[PDB]
Design a protein around this ligand. Sequence first.
Ligand SMILES: CCCCCCCCCCCCCCCCCCCC
Ligand SMILES: CCCCCCCCCCCCCCCCCCCC
Ligand code: SF4
Lengths: 129, 150, 60, 210, 322, 162
Amino acid sequence: STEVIAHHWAFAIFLIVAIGLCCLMLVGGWFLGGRARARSKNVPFESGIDSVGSARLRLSAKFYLVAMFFVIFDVEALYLFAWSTSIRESGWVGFVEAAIFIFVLLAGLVYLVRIGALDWTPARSRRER
Amino acid sequence: DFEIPVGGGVSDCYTRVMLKVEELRQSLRILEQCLNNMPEGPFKADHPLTTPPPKERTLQHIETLITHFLQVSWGPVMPANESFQMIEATKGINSYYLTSDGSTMSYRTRIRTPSYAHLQQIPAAIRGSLVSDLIVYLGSIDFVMSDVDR
Amino acid sequence: MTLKELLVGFGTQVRSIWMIGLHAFAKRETRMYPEEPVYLPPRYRGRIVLTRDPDGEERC
Amino acid sequence: DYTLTRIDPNDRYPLQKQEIVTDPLNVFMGKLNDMVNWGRKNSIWPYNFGLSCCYVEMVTSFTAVHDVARFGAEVLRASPRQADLMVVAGTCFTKMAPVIQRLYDQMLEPKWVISMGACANSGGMYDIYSVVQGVDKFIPVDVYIPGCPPRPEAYMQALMLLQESIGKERRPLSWVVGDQGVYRANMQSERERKRGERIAVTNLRTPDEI
Amino acid sequence: WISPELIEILLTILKAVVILLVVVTCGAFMSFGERRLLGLFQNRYGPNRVGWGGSLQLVADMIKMFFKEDWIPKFSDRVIFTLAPMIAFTSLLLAFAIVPVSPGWVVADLNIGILFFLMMAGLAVYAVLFAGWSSNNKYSLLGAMRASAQTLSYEVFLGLSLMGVVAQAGSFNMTDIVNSQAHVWNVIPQFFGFITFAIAGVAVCHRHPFDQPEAEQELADGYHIEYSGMKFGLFFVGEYIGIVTISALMVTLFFGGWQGPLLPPFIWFALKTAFFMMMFILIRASLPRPRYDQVMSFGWKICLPLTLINLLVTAAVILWQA
Amino acid sequence: MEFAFYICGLIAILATLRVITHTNPVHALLYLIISLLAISGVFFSLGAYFAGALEIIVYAGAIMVLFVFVVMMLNLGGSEIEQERQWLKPQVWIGPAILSAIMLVVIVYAILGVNDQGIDGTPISAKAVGITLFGPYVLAVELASMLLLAGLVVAFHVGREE
Ligand SMILES: CCCCCCCCCCCCCCCCCCCC
Ligand SMILES: CCCCCCCCCCCCCCCCCCCC
Ligand code: SF4
């Protein structure tokens, strides 16, 4: 109808003026103000002294397992997103099935917590002693 | 009269912080005792080597003027001896070790500071920890680099 | 973690929020330099001057 | 009654040339430059750099009992790129002069330098082998503060002096059009200005009073 | 162009542009208000010298940021470095673009709503990730990794905290959510959802205590330390519209949005949004920063099962009264 | 809406083509996010609002952890880029290019032979998907939760440091 077309045009103009304001702001920031000519300008900031190597080294991380579990639990979350918008029309059978769903989720999370997963802290401190 | 805070046997950051809080409270107690009971006497010793001499006697006596004149120009002449004084500083134990060659300067001045020892201890107590633990440990040592390097 | 620890911690955070709000309801402790002059004790060690005798000549 | 500095890396620090020039100040460009200078002097972002005692007094000035935030100078960025003011508050040690030079080079113009304390002004009480006698041996300093340590309102007064210096200086509006040299006003010294009010002081309060 | 449909479309476009200009100006004014309110919370005044009450301090900051040298490092990837402030400025703005501020005053009356908010948060994470990686700095690298861990922690349960309100309204539309609270505000039935959404929404904008990427004390301002000029100002303004967006979103899904007993509806919306903005400044000032490993442990072990249990209880209550 | 579908399809095609033939992993991930946003635009054009919503919600979480693994493993400056550059040679990609081309031709010819009436673009809300998902399609949900549990267990077991 008319109101849907009006809201679509309003959303399009909202996005267009948002990107235009951001790009104009960047252009005004880039074009106004003088530049610099210094010896140590193009050095990454490491608190006043030079780097040992570079900033692009192979950094380790302990967040890998939590990242995969985050993706899995977000997929379970999207299932619950699909469930939650139609709870009333699903009836009690859908409530029982979603209860089984959330119980499997809880059992998986307790399994993750107890086996040592979701625990990547260094063994030195661990907030102990 | 003032109590001494002693921890339970381990040096956490929290333990050090609340020991310093209790030290602040003890210092408040000492200040209260000093304020309520204050003597009425001299603010300088009557020793001839007291530097500087009292100001009014400098201004209207000639022996005191001579003593002040020779004590601010060349300096007081301490005899050739060796002295040491160790005190409890705000950050630990601070000690002065002074060797005099009999001149008006110190032949040797040695200043022991606690932050030097704490900073040397730092690798043995933060190894294996996180950077956040290192930041909290740095915040809970009570060190200044003027004390460390002198 | 222990549920008692979680409840105690949550109470601690809302308590701290309450103290900071009560600080916001309190009196400002500023000294508006340079609108109001900074009070100094008479024996304060600031700028160095050379003075004069009561008779008008310089005392150095 | 101005001065011009032009910078170029390609021997001895500071790598700049300074001369004594005349103010060129345009029915709209002058007011535009005045507006830019007003905006620059009414918002200063000091660098969170500290060396010694004088930094402790600077952050004492930063607190709620003096409130330098009223001048728009509480932002205190820890990165040289985001900062707009280097306050050398402490001793310029020999081993840190390369570090201070690097941190000044990583900073971006519009940049200003405030020496705080006798160590930063001249080396101060430490006429020693391991201290550079004054931080102005290698970086240009805009505002100087005597003291050891300077009291917090002295740092605030130096901030206002820097604001007056910014408010009467000429800088390029854009880096593509116009001259890129920096014009700084040769203002009258505060010693000469305050000689009128300083010699006339007759009686002070005796030290035995509180 | 003389037709009632075309003038209605033009009026809707004008309302959307007015809303966008007001929220951007309010984000900058609330940066200034954060300075003043931190002064008030910390027993001072803050900037009260540039004009009356410091009201021209924002203009001076804007002038300095525009006339600051916009610096692109040679060791950085230029396209990603320029792209990250664009995402940071725009993603939370589009998240705000669904918030109904008044009856008849909304940009897009989407059928997704809070789904679009989740989409914009998942797109807003890439601004911080790209700023950390692109700038080619070690502190920025550590800040980006910490931001990724914090994003894991909050986005594992943000939508599930919102699903209680979604289930109570029975729809994804924003106006249906703000119309379902015509009797009782949603903060009282959804209270555990409320506190979990508070935690997750503070973690959206990376505000205190969840300022793990840009931690001033820990990593010396973090990921945007190579960022300068108006790009850093874009990061600031983007986070401030993020705060405005999260505050207005709590107003819509927990306090009836514009619904109020006596005052005009936009006035009630403005008061509740300003109260939550004050609560953001208070939550910055009040409590300290935890370690991000304990932050992720709290977001996983505590918040996620609590959201799941709250969703189950809300579903049981809804089906009980049907 | 027709133009939106066509331009999003073109953007998705170009972004995917840039993904499969790039040497920078982070740039390839950025073009991948662009392609998935274009796929979401295609989903939103056809009335499948929930499909585009979940394409932006959970795939942006998926590409997020891909980015974490890329910064954890691959980035070494240009050393990754030259190593990937020596791997890609002209004969190497013109080998399977004709295979993919003839596969696309066969699939397109099979597609063009079907009867069509045009997609009317009637929107499908998330309420209908919730009705069907927890109605006729229940054990799909339950055994898919078991599938995600299995994937989580395998990820734990293989991804461990020690
Ligand atoms: C502090 C308040 C922040 C609000 C952010 C969003 C504001 C968007 C612009 C709204 C403009 C229109 C206001 C309502 C107009 C119709 C009602 C008028 C009488 C109250
Ligand atoms: C060192 C090992 C490298 C293995 C590379 C394998 C590349 C395989 C490329 C196959 C290309 C086939 C092209 C079509 C051939 C004709 C149709 C199929 C056979 C009838
Ligand atoms: S001038 Fe005095 S207070 Fe300042 S750094 Fe030097 S010794 Fe310390």
